[PDB]
Amino acid sequence: QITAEQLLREAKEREPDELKEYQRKKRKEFEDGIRKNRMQLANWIKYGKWEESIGEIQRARSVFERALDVDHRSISIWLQYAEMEMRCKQINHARNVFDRAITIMPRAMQFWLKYSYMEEVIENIPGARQIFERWIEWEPPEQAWQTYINFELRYKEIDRARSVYQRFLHVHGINVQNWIKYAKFEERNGYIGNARAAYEKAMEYFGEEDINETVLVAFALFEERQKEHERARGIFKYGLDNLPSNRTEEIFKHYTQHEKKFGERVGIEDVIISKRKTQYEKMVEENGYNYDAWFDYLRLLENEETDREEVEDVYERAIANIPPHSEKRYWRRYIYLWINYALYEELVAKDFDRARQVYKACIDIIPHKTFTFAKVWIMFAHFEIRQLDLNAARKIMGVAIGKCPKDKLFRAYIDLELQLREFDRCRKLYEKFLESSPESSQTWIKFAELETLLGDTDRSRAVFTIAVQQPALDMPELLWKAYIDFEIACEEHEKARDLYETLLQRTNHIKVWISMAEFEQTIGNFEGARKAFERANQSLENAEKEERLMLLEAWKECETKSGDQEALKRVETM
Amino acid sequence: TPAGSVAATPFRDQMRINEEIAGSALEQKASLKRALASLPTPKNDFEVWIEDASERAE
Amino acid sequence: EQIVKIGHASDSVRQYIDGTATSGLLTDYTESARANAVAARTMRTPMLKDT
Amino acid sequence: DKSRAMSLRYAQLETTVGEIDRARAIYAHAAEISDPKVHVKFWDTWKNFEVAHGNEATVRDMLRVRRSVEASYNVN
Ligand SMILES: O=P(O)(O)O[C@H]1[C@H](OP(=O)(O)O)[C@@H](OP(=O)(O)O)[C@H](OP(=O)(O)O)[C@@H](OP(=O)(O)O)[C@H]1OP(=O)(O)O
């Protein structure tokens, strides 16, 4: 098809008196072109260039002098006019053109660069200096001074180049980099006494308060390069004081590199820790909600063995950042910001009366009617036990259960009273625990296990019987297992049998029927298992074939292990 | 689509060992209390590397 | 958060009790959870009431 | 090349967790920088997803983006 490309491609593809008389035609072409357009200056340049070539250079001057009357702020024309005079070798005319150009446009850089270069290529170099001297009178900004300096360096005048810098710093010296470049110029030539003077005068120039510390680091690193290193520490160390928060971020990165050699035992660890300390404080100023920054900060200060009052001020700053959401998913990291504080007060500061206040302040801050940290109530309880104050410890756990009855609290309180050999107090707490969480069959088992460990069988039986009477349980199977296993441990098989009887009266589930048979198999009353299997298999005629099969595989296991081939025929005809 | 699969992971109601009838929470609280108040109390229970950079310097 | 709480509680109980001579009365709480989870995974977007 | 691979990876997580509505937007967002003329393994795995976890109203949505995206490359 012939769409865009082929149509437009096809459209695209279609696409010496005689010399004197020719020259007259060109002049008319230029002059009439000038007449109409006037601001045409590109053609005004071409007419000037064209006349030049012919040796009509005398006329070409006339063209450019007319062209300058039209624009005069003409920097293209001025360049072309001078360059025309230079190629012609007119150099006094070329000088006159530049002397006009720089007079009329003293702040067009191009003329001073071009003019100094012309005189330099002629080896006029006294005159080339005078051009740069004349230029500097205009206070031209940076690049003019750098080009004059570089000019004197190419001659290797270096003390005259130094004079230019000293004047350059007077006009420009508000900019630090001019001082640093000056000092680097003195250093590299080897004048190093001048380089010290240059930095020290730069600091005196910028002052005491508005410390230009990029000078100070530059000064420090120069002295480091000298191997003055005592001076280099001094400069860095001096800077750290007056600079302390914001600008030290630069100082510390050089100061720590400095010490990384010479610091090695005491100097490295000091600067890195103090760097880290201010670096964590930056994170805390950005976001006091950054708990991971507080934990990492507190690690540093504890390994420092920092003075106690400073670590307390840092913990209490960290702790005041209570989560804004008031939902426990956000508190899970924040709560250890209190626990670490109590561990520090107990283990390191050893001020137990102040660790009470840490826990009271902690529990007065948790939104208990919405959620609790059982860790807090547990740790606060065990702390008073280490103070031998059971009355306080019981009050703590008591209000814990009273405000927010929670499983982790009950377990901890019960385990405490068990360790205290306060078995009758454990019992009262289990009854409260069961009232809290009645469905938790594990607690009914753990309650009966307490009674079993204390040797009161009839206590344990009454718990289990009241347990299996409950309208709901998380795992009746776990409880029925536990009570069967208990009656097996009593060897009162005639009651353990009754448990399977009542359990089977609750459900005809095949696994209960199997375990009823396996119970008789483990008594060794193997006929009871067969009578159970028959009682199951003859009654479960309406059970599923796989249910009956799983039942009858258990009997086939029974008879193949006993080896009664006559019974296996009965099994084979089940 | 309801994401049934993760919700399926918490297993519950393993076996029919229950009557599926329950009392109101306050009288169920009393049911435990009035039953578990029957638990006897028959007797009391008692049942009694090298420093060497640093080593030469120091 | 609720799901993983219930799951970890049930599984820990399973590991404590099981491996005893009167087991098998217990319905395999961790493995039955696995069996339930793989069965439920097949599911589809329903169409639309309006169309 | 890897962003498609990561899209298959991410869809496998959302489909095992059962966030099947998110899985479609993973595939559909990957389908626009895939072509059915050489990336057939991507379209097969999305097709095997949509026949399993999808239905007529979204299977046709798959076939719409398929013919749209191939048209982007098949300028001939
Ligand atoms: O409420 P519980 O069933 O008694 O579970 C608690 C509790 O978990 P919750 O978040 O559900 O309350 C603890 O959590 P906290 O209240 O202390 O935040 C938790 O402690 P961790 O959060 O420190 O894990 C503890 O687990 P562990 O004893 O391993 O610390 C766990 O107990 P379980 O192991 O009995 O579930």
Measure the CA–CA gap between A355 and A554, rounded to whole angstroms. 63
Token pair listed for A441? 């069959």
Measure the CA–CA gap between A207 and A196, rounded to whole angstroms. 16
CA of A409 relative to ligand 1 center, distance in Å = 10
Measure the CA–CA gap between A197 and A11, rounded to whole angstroms. 76
Q: Find tokens 């098949």 and name the residue.
A: D74
CA of A419 relative to ligand 1 center, distance in Å = 21
Give the max Cα distance, chain D. Answer: 42
Q: Find tokens 């009950």 and name the residue.
A: A410
Nearest to A463 among B14, B17, B39 (CB): B39
Q: How far is B13 from chain C (nearest CA, A)?
A: 10
CB atoms within 10 A of CB A314: 22
Measure the CA–CA gap between D14 and D10, rounded to whole angstroms. 6
CA of A368 relative to ligand 1 center, distance in Å = 15
Token pair listed for A295? 């934990």
Which residue CA neighbors atom 4 of ligand 1 most closely?
A408
Is C5 annotated as contributing to ligand binding?
yes
Neighbours of chain C (3+ CB pairs under 8 A): A, B, D
CB contact under 8 A, D16 and B4: no
Q: What backbone phi and psi angles, to 5 degrees, belong to A376?
A: -65, -55
Q: Read out DSSP for A474-526?
A: S-HHHHHHHHHHHHHHTT-HHHHHHHHHHHHHH---HHHHHHHHHHHHHHT-H
Token pair listed for A349? 């500061």
∠ CA A63-A69-A75, nearest 5°, is 85
Which residue CA neighbors atom 7 of ligand 1 most closely?
A408
CB atoms within 10 A of CB A93: 17
Q: Read out DSSP for A406-419?
A: -HHHHHHHHHHHHH
Measure the CA–CA gap between A214 and A247, rounded to whole angstroms. 9
Q: Does B8 touch chain D (CB under 8 A)?
A: no
Binding-site residue positions of A:
328, 332, 374-375, 406, 408, 411
CB contact under 8 A, B10 and C3: yes
Cβ-in-10-Å burial (0-12, 13-18, 19+) of B54 comes to: exposed
Q: How far is A375 from chain C (nearest CA, A)?
A: 17
Q: Does D21 touch chain B (CB under 8 A)?
A: yes
Resolution limit in angstroms?
A: 3.0
Beta strands in A331-406 (DSSP E): none
Q: Which residues of A touch C17 (CB under 8 A)?
A: 478, 481
Measure the CA–CA gap between A399 and A378, rounded to whole angstroms. 12
Measure the CA–CA gap between C10 and A312, rounded to whole angstroms. 42
- Is A375 a pocket residue for ligand 1 (Cβ < 6 Å)? yes
Of all residues in chain D, the one with the smallest CA distance to C47 is D57
The CA-atom distances, in angstroms, between A533 and each of A174, A505, A513, A529, C41 are 106, 15, 8, 6, 38
- Is A380 a pocket residue for ligand 1 (Cβ < 6 Å)? no
Angle, helices A159-172/A176-189, rounded to nearest 10 degrees: 170
* Method used to determine the 3D structure: cryo-EM
Question: Long-range contact list for C31-39, CB < 8 A, 24+ apart?
Answer: C32/B11, C32/B14, C33/B8, C33/B9, C33/B10, C33/B11, C33/C7, C36/B8, C36/B9, C36/B11, C37/B5, C37/B6, C37/B8, C37/B9, C39/B8
